[PDB]
Design a protein around this nucleic acid. Structure first.
Lengths: 93, 86, 107, 96, 408, 93
DNA sequence: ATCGGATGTATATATCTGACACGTGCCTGGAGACTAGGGAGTAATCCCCTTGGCGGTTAAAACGCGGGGGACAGCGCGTACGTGCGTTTAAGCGGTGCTAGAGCTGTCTACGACCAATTGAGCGGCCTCGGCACCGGGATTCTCGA
DNA sequence: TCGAGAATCCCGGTGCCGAGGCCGCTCAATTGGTCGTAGACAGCTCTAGCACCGCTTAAACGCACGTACGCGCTGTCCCCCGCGTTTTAACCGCCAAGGGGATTACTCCCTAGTCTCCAGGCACGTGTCAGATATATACATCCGAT
């Protein structure tokens, strides 16, 4: 049956930073199960911030504040600035 | 009105107040170098809690670090605090 | 750049179609906003790019082309930020960081 | 009349383990919180029951560290804690 | 400018990217304005000082506000002349002091105002449009043949009402015409004002775009683009058609979709304004922004600071961005770095970025009267500026330099 | 306006097993905060458990299999028997 | 073993106080009736993967030996932590003032849910080949008894 | 301070399969429409946090001192490492078999949604009672001297 994955989508980021290297199928299942874990910590935390404030919407502001809660130090500051760079390509174009 | 850059309030966590926290832990003889080490470990614990405690308010668009948001800051680090709601 | 496939409108390589599905039938909140899967797919792009930069980086040191799981623990535990993010975790078939306590080293 | 080195301490322990008031004073601890919160915002305003929840959660952690400072300083066969004892108990627990 | 003739291979940027200085000024500031060259930075300080900085060693040369005319309250805005000779300084001590650096501590002519100010803008080096608070006209103050007759020229026609538009809060002159003054009301509307430099003025252009308090109106230095910063969350860049006769049209809208911040100050690029900057208002916004003014996208972010940045300045020679971090008070500064080159150790090195496969030639086994001119200066730099105007060098204080070992 | 609590529903169970004994107002707020925390452990664990089997219903069967995970040991053998007693006495009555 | 104080600690009245258990009002959330409906149960197939067995081959464990060093007790030193006594210097307090911000109400505009109508990227399946396992010569080098 | 020894490193050749590249192919992504409602405004009331002051003294502060504990330095012996020889079960690669997981397909009954009702329980005002200080005291552990 159709069991989806993030298998091909990790592969298109490996062929951006290191365009000659490959990846094993065990170390694909780690990155397939890495992305499935940082999902449940970001949408898991930004389902409390949009519940403590009696909102009902995961906006794009909570995923900013979910990331500044989880990610430590200088990964927060770069991934926040990777976010608003990529939602503004979405809003204009 | 008053722009006071507050510095060295860490020296109010006094040498006879780390003694009494030592006593409630039930320890007998304290070194001379604990007193400038516990303040190094107190200022690490308060930095992690208040940075999350501000973030919960800064998202909530207030200028008050209310006691629901300190309790939520402690719950995220796995040190739940019963006594102020949640 | 394009019109179809919202990731290409955003300029990501992670799908914003799948992430917007997985914020509704995962039941995280009532009504997920339209900007929310865009921001989340960009962060999951960046953390996958940050690992696979450092993974193949220590793939080059080993001198092998492809990445085995042993290279992933060497990319995670050698980096402090990643280490903090992946503090609890155990990467399967991944070895440990090579260190000896230096009292045990000889005279 | 200068009772013995050590048994004022065991009279000091049994007083403090049987009592439950807050040990760090209120006003110096309230200026420590308003010093550390200057880095993360400027002109904050702490609601005055959230400088109790930062006290009774902080000195219930410092006490819970000295219970694990003492178990490893007994382990080195002495009764004197030291800063090479604290940084074991933070490292084994996983604060480093 | 000969350092940029030798620095690159020939590629030089069009915005700074990194931030390499920081003026340790512990008393805070309000406005930072450079000279018309990159040498001197006028700093509008918070208590009422002006601590003018030489931009080569990060330590000052003067202080306007020693002999006569020191600002008691804060100083709000400042501009410079065409050559950098004078200073026109607007403050909250109800005083607009035209200073001159020939006497680098004394004012020349002041005016006791009816209240505080917001901004100042010069058209010529003497005449200066000021924004008196709670006034629906702009009493532009001109230094005439006598200094005393500050003619409070009301920038409004005698019949025209901006009742329902509030007061005028911004006035910025046109670069290329030098006689039509664009002003923006406190509620929405934008006027034009053609000063005859007699005192006839024509309200050629009036309109309303959106109901907000217009904090700032800038014009691009080619006179093409004009950006408006409201009190709501938008930046409307407009295109300017002046042959007088004026009409604008909407080019682009720039917003922060995530946090919805207010934009404090905005500033344009050098030649035709191909890049728009801004500084946001709310806390955790720690960075100036950039925008490609045609496409509209967020293209780069000046991620150097730790605080919220209030004012801005872009001098085009040194390509710097000066900005007071409002919380601490220190002037953050960005600069185009130039990395060093070992290619200038000997007269023939080369820095190739890759292992080149040089082809094997035959040679490896074998064993004037041009025209000379000495008189003209330079005419155009690598940036392509108005250069060959030898600027008004600010003289250092040669009245009391001997004292400056003893007691300031 | 109004802030709900579990203040009164604690108070009947205090007078049930200790019928002369009062409680304070600070030590009610702990027992108010304790009930809210055993909720979001149990209903948290009985939500992921509904998701892992790809059901969409928290039935009574999930909360039997969420009490049996969190509650350590002899509290698990009691609070299962205190549950299925009270789900028969709701259904049959 | 045990004296002599002895001194703080735990064991009894007093009695005031402001925390709490209690009595009225009300209001909004809970309870029932019932409706359509889809999600779960309950059959059914079917075939994939686990349990079992075995016949090898042999890496690995199990065992025993010597010898070495690391643990552990002992002792002595010296230093620094405790004890207290005497003395400052804020903490606590209560009190009044003040106001900046929190909370709520109410308008009202943007915007996410949802529907269908279309389709094209994504998963599954299939071929294929090169990256790494897998061993051999030698060169270094890494220790240790010379 | 080192020459014999041996484990590691390293570089090589030859082989394997599993990573990668496509071929078709369906369902999930897109979108382009409605639709109400959640959140975004200003606005207003108010209360709770902050600033201050006078006081009262409890607690920090400093110093002096003597004492016990850390530390270091011994010697001892025991027990852990090292290694050879024998032993045994892990492993791999077979076999085969069938249980159970996975899907499909009807079917139905539980519940979501809506409405109609009403009292549970919320906040408030109430007296009152179990406290905690305020107070002398009987005796447990502690201590210098015997």
């Amino acid at each position: 049956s159709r069991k989806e994955s993030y298998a091909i989508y990790v592969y298109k980021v490996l062929k951006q930073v290191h365009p000659d290297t490959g990846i094993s199928s065990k170390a694909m299942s780690i990155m397939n199960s890495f992305v499935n874990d940082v999902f449940e910590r970001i949408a898991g935390e930004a389902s409390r911030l949009a519940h403590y404030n009696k909102r009902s919407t995961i906006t794009s502001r909570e995923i900013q504040t979910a990331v500044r809660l989880l990610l430590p130090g200088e990964l927060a500051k770069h991934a926040v600035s990777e976010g608003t760079k990529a939602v503004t390509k979405y809003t204009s174009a | 009105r008053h722009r006071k850059v507050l510095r060295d309030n860490i020296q109010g966590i006094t040498k006879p107040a780390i003694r009494r926290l030592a006593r409630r832990g039930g320890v007998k003889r304290i070194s001379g170098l604990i007193y400038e080490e516990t303040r190094g470990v107190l200022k690490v614990f308060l930095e992690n809690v208040i940075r999350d405690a501000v973030t919960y308010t800064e998202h909530a668009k207030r200028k008050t670090v209310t006691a629901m948001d300190v309790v939520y800051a402690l719950k995220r680090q796995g040190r739940t605090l019963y006594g102020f709601g949640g | 750049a394009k019109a179809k496939t919202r990731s290409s409108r955003a300029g990501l390589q992670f799908p914003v179609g799948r992430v917007h599905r997985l914020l509704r039938k995962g039941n995280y909140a009532e009504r997920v906003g339209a900007g929310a899967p865009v921001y989340l797919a960009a962060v999951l792009e960046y953390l996958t790019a940050e690992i696979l930069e450092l993974a193949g980086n220590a793939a080059r040191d080993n001198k092998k082309t492809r990445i085995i799981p042993r290279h992933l623990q060497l990319a995670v535990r050698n980096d402090e930020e990643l280490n903090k993010l992946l503090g609890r975790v155990t990467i399967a078939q991944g070895g440990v960081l090579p260190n000896i306590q230096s009292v045990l080293l000889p005279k | 009349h200068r009772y013995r080195p050590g048994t004022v301490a065991l009279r000091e322990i049994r007083r403090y383990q049987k009592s439950t008031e807050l040990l760090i004073r209120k006003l110096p601890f309230q200026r420590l919180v308003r010093e550390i919160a200057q880095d993360f915002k400027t002109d904050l305003r702490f609601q005055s029951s959230a400088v109790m929840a930062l006290q009774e959660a902080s000195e219930a952690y410092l006490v819970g560290l000295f219970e694990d400072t003492n178990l490893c300083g007994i382990h080195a066969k002495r009764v004197t804690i030291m800063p090479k004892d604290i940084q074991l108990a933070r490292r084994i627990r996983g604060e480093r | 400018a000969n350092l940029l003739l030798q620095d690159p291979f020939g590629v030089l940027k069009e915005y700074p990217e990194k931030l390499t200085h920081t003026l340790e000024v512990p008393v805070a500031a309000v406005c930072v304005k450079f000279s018309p060259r990159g040498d001197y930075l006028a700093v509008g300080c918070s208590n009422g000082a002006i601590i003018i900085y030489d931009m080569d060693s990060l330590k000052p040369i003067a202080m306007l506000g020693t002999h006569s005319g020191a600002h008691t309250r804060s100083v709000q805005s400042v501009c410079w002349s065409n050559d950098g000779r004078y200073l026109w300084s607007s403050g909250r001590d109800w005083y607009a002091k035209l200073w001159d650096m020939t006497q680098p501590t004394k004012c020349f002519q002041q005016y006791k105002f009816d209240g505080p100010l917001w901004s100042c803008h010069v058209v010529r080096w003497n005449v200066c449009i000021v924004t008196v608070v709670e006034e629906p006209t702009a009493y532009v103050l001109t230094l005439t043949d006598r200094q005393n007759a500050f003619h409070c020229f009301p920038l409004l026609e005698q019949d025209q009402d901006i009742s329902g538009h509030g007061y005028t809060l911004v006035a910025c002159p046109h670069p290329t015409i030098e006689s039509i003054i664009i002003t923006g009301t406190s509620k929405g509307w934008i006027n034009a004002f053609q000063l005859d430099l007699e005192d006839k003025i024509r309200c050629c252009y009036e309109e309303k775009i959106a109901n907000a308090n217009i904090k700032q109106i800038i014009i691009s230095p080619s006179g093409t683009r004009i950006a408006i910063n409201g009190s709501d969350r938008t930046i409307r860049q407009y295109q300017l058609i002046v042959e007088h006769s004026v009409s604008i049209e909407l080019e682009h809208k720039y917003q922060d979709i995530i946090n919805r911040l207010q934009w404090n100050t905005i500033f344009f690029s050098n030649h035709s304004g191909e890049y728009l900057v801004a500084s946001a208002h709310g806390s955790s916004a720690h960075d100036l922004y950039l925008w490609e003014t045609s496409s509209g996208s967020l293209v780069r972010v000046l991620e150097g600071a730790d605080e919220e940045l209030l004012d801005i300045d872009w001098n085009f020679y040194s390509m710097r961005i000066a900005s007071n971090g409002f919380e601490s008070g220190w002037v953050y500064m960005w600069s185009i770095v130039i990395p060093p080159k070992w290619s200038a150790l000997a007269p023939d090195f080369e820095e190739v970025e890759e292992n080149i496969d040089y082809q094997e030639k035959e040679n490896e086994f074998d064993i004037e009267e041009i025209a000379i001119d000495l008189c003209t200066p330079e005419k155009y730099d690598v940036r392509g500026n108005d250069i060959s105007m030898p600027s008004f060098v600010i003289p250092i204080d040669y009245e009391g330099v001997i004292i400056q070992q003893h007691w300031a």
